[PDB]
Design a protein around this motif. Structure first.
Motif, PDB file in Angstrom:
ATOM      1  N   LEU A 140     -40.272   1.721  95.951  1.00 20.88           N
ATOM      2  CA  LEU A 140     -39.600   0.485  96.307  1.00 20.88           C
ATOM      3  C   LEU A 140     -38.592   0.731  97.427  1.00 20.88           C
ATOM      4  O   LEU A 140     -38.043   1.829  97.546  1.00 20.88           O
ATOM      5  CB  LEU A 140     -38.887  -0.099  95.095  1.00 20.88           C
ATOM      6  N   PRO A 141     -38.329  -0.276  98.268  1.00 20.60           N
ATOM      7  CA  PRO A 141     -38.898  -1.627  98.272  1.00 20.60           C
ATOM      8  C   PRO A 141     -40.316  -1.645  98.807  1.00 20.60           C
ATOM      9  O   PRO A 141     -40.737  -0.723  99.495  1.00 20.60           O
ATOM     10  CB  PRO A 141     -37.937  -2.393  99.182  1.00 20.60           C
ATOM     11  N   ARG A 162     -42.990  -9.076  97.603  1.00 19.14           N
ATOM     12  CA  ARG A 162     -41.777  -8.415  98.068  1.00 19.14           C
ATOM     13  C   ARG A 162     -41.046  -7.747  96.914  1.00 19.14           C
ATOM     14  O   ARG A 162     -39.822  -7.854  96.794  1.00 19.14           O
ATOM     15  CB  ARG A 162     -40.847  -9.398  98.773  1.00 19.14           C
ATOM     16  N   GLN A 183     -38.882  -5.452  94.882  1.00 21.96           N
ATOM     17  CA  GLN A 183     -37.802  -4.591  95.334  1.00 21.96           C
ATOM     18  C   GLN A 183     -36.759  -4.484  94.236  1.00 21.96           C
ATOM     19  O   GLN A 183     -36.717  -5.299  93.312  1.00 21.96           O
ATOM     20  CB  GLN A 183     -37.170  -5.118  96.622  1.00 21.96           C
ATOM     21  N   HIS A 184     -35.910  -3.469  94.355  1.00 25.83           N
ATOM     22  CA  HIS A 184     -34.822  -3.290  93.413  1.00 25.83           C
ATOM     23  C   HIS A 184     -33.784  -4.392  93.590  1.00 25.83           C
ATOM     24  O   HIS A 184     -33.771  -5.124  94.582  1.00 25.83           O
ATOM     25  CB  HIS A 184     -34.164  -1.926  93.603  1.00 25.83           C
ATOM     26  N   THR A 244     -26.701  -1.981 101.658  1.00 25.95           N
ATOM     27  CA  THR A 244     -27.885  -1.145 101.795  1.00 25.95           C
ATOM     28  C   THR A 244     -28.039  -0.727 103.249  1.00 25.95           C
ATOM     29  O   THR A 244     -28.127  -1.586 104.132  1.00 25.95           O
ATOM     30  CB  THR A 244     -29.136  -1.881 101.314  1.00 25.95           C
ATOM     31  N   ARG A 255     -30.545   0.185 104.642  1.00 30.32           N
ATOM     32  CA  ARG A 255     -31.714  -0.574 105.069  1.00 30.32           C
ATOM     33  C   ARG A 255     -31.311  -1.937 105.606  1.00 30.32           C
ATOM     34  O   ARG A 255     -31.919  -2.446 106.554  1.00 30.32           O
ATOM     35  CB  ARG A 255     -32.685  -0.725 103.900  1.00 30.32           C
TER      36      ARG A 255
END
Ligand SMILES: *[C@@H]1O[C@H](CO)[C@@H](O[C@@H]2O[C@H](CO)[C@@H](O[C@@H]3O[C@H](CO)[C@@H](O)[C@H](O)[C@@H]3O)[C@H](O)[C@H]2NC(C)=O)[C@H](O)[C@H]1NC(C)=O
Ligand SMILES: *[C@@H]1O[C@H](CO)[C@@H](O)[C@H](O)[C@H]1NC(C)=O
Ligand SMILES: *[C@@H]1O[C@H](CO)[C@@H](O)[C@H](O)[C@H]1NC(C)=O
Ligand SMILES: *[C@@H]1O[C@H](CO)[C@@H](O)[C@H](O)[C@H]1NC(C)=O
Ligand SMILES: *[C@@H]1O[C@H](CO)[C@@H](O)[C@H](O)[C@H]1NC(C)=O
Ligand SMILES: [Ca+2]
Ligand SMILES: [Ca+2]
Ligand SMILES: [Ca+2]
Length: 1131
Positions: free
Chosen positions: A433-434, A441, A443-444, A628, A630
């Motif tokens: 993940l993600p 989608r 994801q955490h 994040t 990300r």
């Protein structure tokens, strides 16, 4: 008729017969009350000669103090104003504090000036023996001392009725030894307005009272006003009321505000928030204050008619405030809460041990150990969420959910498997993940909880231990099969099954949604895991009680905690580890609250601390958009999230790949699905990027049936892991890869052990199987089993509003709730809106806050013609209705079945059970405490102002016929009511005795109508009732359940010689010896043709228990003599 005595003026008195005098005592003398069988006593408290407080004592137990400044007490504690209680409705009538007791008969008022008053009923003629003189027409003998000697000195007689109390000693009150031109009151015998009264009570005593006052009358232009007002009130009570007086010289009797002292102001007093119930204002005119005119009486002072605030959730709201519900919004018009009518997104919470909240909220617990279809599109297959439940905690009543196996068919054929521990296994192999795809989608989340998300319609929130929170947009509307039921906004039908019939039992409904055919079908779903583990009961109760405490009081109004309280109890008593499961239940309720829109801390040291990882902080209500690295690497993706209450990081920091947050500008540079450390230059043949901050800046065997195992290509073919059985053929079977076993021919399903054709396989109802072509009757509808599917006949049957017990009601659509009311409420009514109304059934009661033995329901049926009031044990018709043609009083058995019209078929128990039966005609056209008969259970708490209320207490309070009586306080208590809670001994015996509902006799019917509502109604209303001798409180609930069972053709003979015995001997007792004809029949027929009712009638109920005469074929029954005789001897 009724007498009247008032302690008017300053230390003056007027007996019930006219005799008046002056007395300024100090010992709270007895104003009224019989001297033989007292049973109650009005006491006029006195302070230093001044009239302070008017007390009433019932027998020797109930004490109420009224005071002159408006304060009230129970004897040792203060109380609010309306304060309805056991009799003694203490209210504000027309600006005067009115204390009304009707069961005994009297009305005590205290106007602004402090002039007491009392209106004793005729039944005390010559019987009252208080300070107000005996109620005999003779007015010269009204000084009867308590000693029984008729005196002439008023002070001796007055002091003979002193009532000392503990600290409140007293002595002989003696007249003040004070002696002495405002001759204004001489008009009492001069002015025409007063002159009209001269034929009635003479003014001469009042002129003498003038002279006595005038002698001192400390003040200015007040020496006359008390006497004038007293004379006016006395004349009004005696008959004609002096109109127009007070316009010459009176002191303008004080009023709290909006000075409007007006003779003959109707007590009905249409106020700001009232249901506009006309024809109930029959109470006689009473002098009192009022609003100016255009103003309407609000909760407090008077306000303009166009200013009436709306009321919701037991609080006021200025017009136009327009607060918003979950997704719809209301506007707060002139007390009408006009609300939107959109459809909100659904949810199928699956938290806890085994607890489900269908899209249409249908909180229930299944606890079955197999793979079950949670939700599926059916209409257009686009997702097939499936859960796999496995027992935990080595206890039978503990069936967690271990995994989920979403089956999005849009993405080729994906098999996303949200594993235990928050792992994801898209088509076998785990995935890091993600994850991104066409629209998937997964994801955490801020918490360690995967969040699958399809194309903005699906949104799951798997969390490992098990928390699935399938969330759907209104697009899926009413097309969603599975354990979450059709997402059509109606909670009634959410127990549907693939066969197309709703299962009355949770067990059958749950078993219907199995996938593996070998799994054991669930038997009785135990409701109390504590019984198996008694050591946990104390902690379970005392810990889950927090859900009903002030910490959650804010959310209490938004989401009812009762289902969550029950779930918490079940989990704590059933889970392996009490701490974690308790925290899970509390967090579930808190999450429901937060999603509704209210945030509650509820997280304290020791209790459920989130204990965020070092480097993270808790910060309830944090933001998830950032946090994040990300996020920095993709700074233009999206931000449409809200508070999450997860474990975030200090401001300026950022979650990194490892998990720490010390990175601030040293973050990876996620790019092209690759991780680059800070300042990692990189130049390919057509670009060059450098990782700065977080962003990657860049430029440029068994015959005769054939046997097949599988093709073994990629483990897709259906092996023995799922063999399509007609009970599960329609369901989407799980795919665990080829097992290489037997399978039935493709064009026919399996059954038991022999494979049979699909079109020939029985349907199911209540577990029982019905072969194709068979049929079953549900209510007034019949269904036929075809293609393993029920084809039912659509005839909306009659709905039966009921009032089981005294505090519980059953709406037309089927909702059951608790409402311990005291005032008069609108049980049913069709004066809802534009539709022209035709009837109003009011179910006002007395002394029924806590279901009591003396509680009695007074039902007034305002049919087109007039009142048909039911009270005590017989019908009274205090109005000739316009069309008496459609009117019957059939009293078969113990009931008073009425036929007030073509559809209205009120059925009465001759007691606290009242049933209203309506036909298709009154569909969606009725309103009141029993919903609107629309077939939707969710919209059955719509308050009088056209808004849905979460708490039934507010919804009931919105339907009170009056508007000043009282409002039932929102009691935060839970099961085991007050008299039940701290008794244990009574709690256990009550629970056991109110278990006959599940006994063998009722066993046949329990499977047809669940007894849990009646189990609650019996556990409640039986602990509350202190049944002494009269044992009806407990017996009535059981009888009501038996009646409901009989309506479904499941007659039960449950009465015995030691369990609620019912005798019929007195009927057969006759001068001719014994008749032997009147006997108790557990069911008996409906209205039987009798001499007074020869023609047959269409009764709402086909069968009704009670006494009946089993007369031979001839000589049908009569009415007056309750004996069956030849048809000749009657009209
Ligand atoms: C209406 O009149 C009644 C009767 O006088 C008032 O009740 C009185 O209220 C006062 C307010 O505190 C009480 O004073 C307190 O009394 C307690 C107990 O004696 C004492 O410990 C306190 O230090 C304080 O002195 C008084 O006791 C109480 N008298 C009663 C109940 O007989 C009432 O307050 C009046 N209404 C309003 C709105 O003021
Ligand atoms: C009052 O009671 C006495 C004795 O009970 C009785 O003799 C007398 O007639 C009663 N008075 C009236 C007016 O009924
Ligand atoms: C995260 O979001 C909040 C709220 O918009 C904002 O104040 C903050 O600057 C953002 N960045 C960090 C590192 O917290
Ligand atoms: C119900 O029966 C009628 C008459 O046989 C038929 O036309 C109709 O299709 C049936 N309905 C369903 C849902 O099968
Ligand atoms: C009650 O009455 C019905 C019909 O009259 C009869 O079939 C039934 O046996 C009766 N039950 C008893 C207990 O008498
Ligand atoms: Ca008298
Ligand atoms: Ca539904
Ligand atoms: Ca409804």
């Amino acid at each position: 008729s009724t007498a009247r005595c008032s302690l008017f003026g300053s230390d003056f008195v007027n007996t019930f017969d006219g005799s008046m005098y002056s007395f300024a005592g100090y010992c709270s003398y007895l104003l009224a009350g019989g001297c033989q069988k007292r049973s109650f006593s009005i006491i006029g408290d006195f302070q230093n000669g001044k009239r302070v407080s008017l007390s009433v004592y019932l027998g020797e137990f109930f004490d109420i103090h009224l005071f002159v400044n408006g304060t009230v007490t129970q004897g040792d504690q203060r109380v609010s104003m309306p304060y309805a209680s056991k009799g003694l409705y203490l209210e504000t009538e027309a600006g005067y504090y009115k204390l009304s007791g009707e069961a005994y008969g009297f009305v005590a008022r205290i106007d602004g000036s402090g002039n007491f008053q009392v209106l004793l009923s005729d039944r005390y003629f010559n019987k009252t023996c208080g300070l107000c003189g005996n109620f005999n027409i003779f007015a010269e003998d009204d000084f009867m001392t308590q000693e029984g000697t008729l005196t002439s000195d008023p002070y001796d007689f007055a002091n003979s009725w002193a009532l000392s109390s503990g600290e409140q000693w007293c002595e002989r009150a003696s007249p003040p030894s004070s002696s002495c031109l405002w001759e204004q009151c001489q008009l009492l015998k001069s002015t025409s307005v007063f002159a009209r009264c001269h034929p009635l009570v003479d003014p001469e005593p009042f002129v003498a009272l003038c002279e006595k006052t005038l002698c001192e009358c400390a003040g200015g232009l007040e020496c006359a006003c008390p006497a004038l007002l007293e004379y006016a009130r006395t004349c009004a009570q005696e008959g004609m009321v002096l109109y127009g007086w007070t316009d010459h010289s009176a002191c303008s009797p004080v009023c709290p505000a909006g000075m409007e002292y007006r003779q003959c102001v109707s007590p009905c007093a249409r106020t700001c928030q009232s249901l506009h119930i006309n024809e109930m204002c029959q109470e006689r005119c009473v002098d009192g204050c009022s609003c100016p005119e255009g103003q309407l009486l609000d909760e407090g002072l008077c306000v303009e008619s166009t200013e009436c605030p709306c009321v919701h959730s037991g609080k006021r709201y200025p017009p136009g405030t327009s607060l918003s519900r979950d997704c719809n919004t209301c506007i707060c018009r002139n007390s009408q809460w006009i609300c939107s009518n959109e459809e909100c997104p659904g949810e199928c919470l699956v938290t806890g041990q085994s607890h489900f909240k269908s899209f249409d909220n249908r909180y229930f617990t299944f606890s079955g150990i197999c793979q079950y279809l949670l939700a599926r599109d059916c209409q257009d297959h686009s997702f097939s969420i499936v859960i796999e439940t496995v027992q935990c905690a080595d206890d039978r009543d503990a069936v967690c959910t271990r995994s989920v196996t979403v089956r999005l068919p849009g993405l080729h054929n994906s098999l996303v498997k949200l594993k235990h521990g928050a792992g994801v296994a898209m088509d076998g192999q785990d995935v890091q993940l993600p994850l991104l795809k066409g629209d998937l989608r997964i994801q955490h989340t801020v918490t360690a909880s995967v969040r699958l998300s399809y194309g903005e319609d699906l949104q799951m929130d798997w969390d490992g231990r098990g928390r699935l929170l399938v969330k759907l947009s209104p697009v899926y509307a009413g097309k969603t099969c599975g354990l979450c039921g059709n997402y059509n906004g109606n909670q009634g039908d959410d127990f549907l099954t693939p066969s197309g019939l709703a299962e009355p039992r949770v067990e059958d409904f749950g078993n219907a949604w199995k996938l593996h055919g070998d799994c054991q079908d669930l038997q009785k779903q135990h409701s109390d895991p504590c019984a198996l583990n008694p050591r946990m009961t104390r902690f379970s109760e005392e810990a889950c009680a927090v859900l009903t405490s002030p910490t959650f009081e804010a959310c209490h109004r938004a989401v009812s905690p009762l289902p969550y309280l029950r779930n918490c109890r079940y989990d704590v008593c059933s889970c392996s580890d009490g701490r974690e499961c308790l925290c899970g239940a509390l967090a579930s309720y808190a999450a429901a609250c937060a999603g509704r829109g209210v945030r509650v801390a509820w997280r304290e040291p020791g209790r459920c601390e989130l204990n965020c990882p070092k480097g993270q902080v808790y910060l309830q209500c944090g933001t998830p958009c950032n946090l994040t690295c990300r996020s920095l690497s993709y700074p233009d993706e999206e931000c449409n999230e809200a508070c999450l209450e997860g474990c975030f990081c200090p401001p300026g920091l950022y979650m990194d790949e490892r998990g720490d947050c010390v990175p601030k500008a040293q973050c990876p540079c996620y790019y092209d699905g690759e991780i680059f450390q800070p300042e990692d230059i990189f130049s390919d043949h057509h670009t060059m990027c450098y990782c700065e901050d977080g962003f990657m800046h860049c430029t440029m065997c068994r015959p005769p049936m054939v046997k097949l195992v599988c093709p073994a290509d990629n483990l897709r073919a259906e092996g023995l892991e799922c063999t399509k059985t007609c009970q599960n053929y329609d369901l989407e079977c799980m795919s665990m890869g080829c097992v290489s076993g037997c399978l039935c021919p493709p064009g026919m399903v399996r059954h038991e052990n022999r494979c049979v054709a699909l079109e020939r396989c029985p349907c199911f109802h209540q577990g029982k199987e019905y072969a194709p072509g068979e049929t079953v009757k549900i209510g007034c509808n019949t269904c036929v089993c075809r293609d393993r599917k029920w084809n039912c006949t659509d005839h909306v049957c009659d709905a039966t509003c009921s009032t089981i017990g005294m505090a519980h009601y059953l709406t037309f659509d089927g909702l059951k709730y608790l409402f311990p009311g005291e005032c008069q409420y609108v049980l049913v009514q069709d004066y809802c809106g534009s539709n022209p109304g035709t009837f109003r059934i009011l179910v006002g009661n007395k002394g029924c806050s806590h279901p009591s033995v003396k509680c009695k329901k007074r039902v007034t049926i305002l049919v087109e013609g007039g009142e048909i009031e039911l009270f005590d044990g017989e019908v009274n018709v205090k109005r000739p209705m316009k069309d008496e043609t459609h009117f019957e009083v059939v009293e078969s058995g113990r009931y008073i079945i009425l036929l007030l019209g073509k559809a209205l078929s009120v059925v009465w128990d001759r007691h606290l059970s009242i049933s209203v039966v309506l036909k298709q005609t009154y569909q969606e056209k009725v309103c009141g405490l029993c919903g609107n008969f629309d077939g939707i259970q969710n919209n059955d708490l719509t308050s009088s102002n056209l808004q849905v209320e979460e708490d039934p207490v507010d919804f009931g309070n919105s339907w009170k016929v009056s508007s000043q009586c009282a409002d039932t306080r929102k009691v935060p208590l839970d099961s085991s009511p007050a008299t039940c809670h701290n008794n244990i001994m009574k709690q256990t015996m009550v629970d056991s005795s109110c278990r006959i509902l599940t006994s063998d006799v009722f066993q046949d019917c329990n499977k047809l109508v669940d007894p849990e509502p009646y189990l609650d109604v019996c556990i409640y209303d039986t602990c509350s009732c202190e049944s002494i001798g009269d044992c009806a409180c407990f017996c009535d609930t059981i009888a009501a359940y038996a009646h409901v069972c009989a309506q479904h053709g499941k007659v039960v003979t449950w009465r015995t010689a030691t369990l609620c015995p019912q005798s019929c001997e007195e009927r057969n007792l006759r001068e001719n010896g014994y008749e032997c004809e009147w006997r108790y029949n557990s069911c008996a027929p409906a209205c039987q043709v009798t001499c007074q009712h020869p023609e047959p009638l269409a009764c709402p109920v086909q069968c009704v228990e009670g006494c009946h005469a089993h007369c031979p074929p001839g000589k049908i029954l009569d009415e007056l003599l309750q004996t069956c005789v030849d048809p000749e001897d009657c009209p």
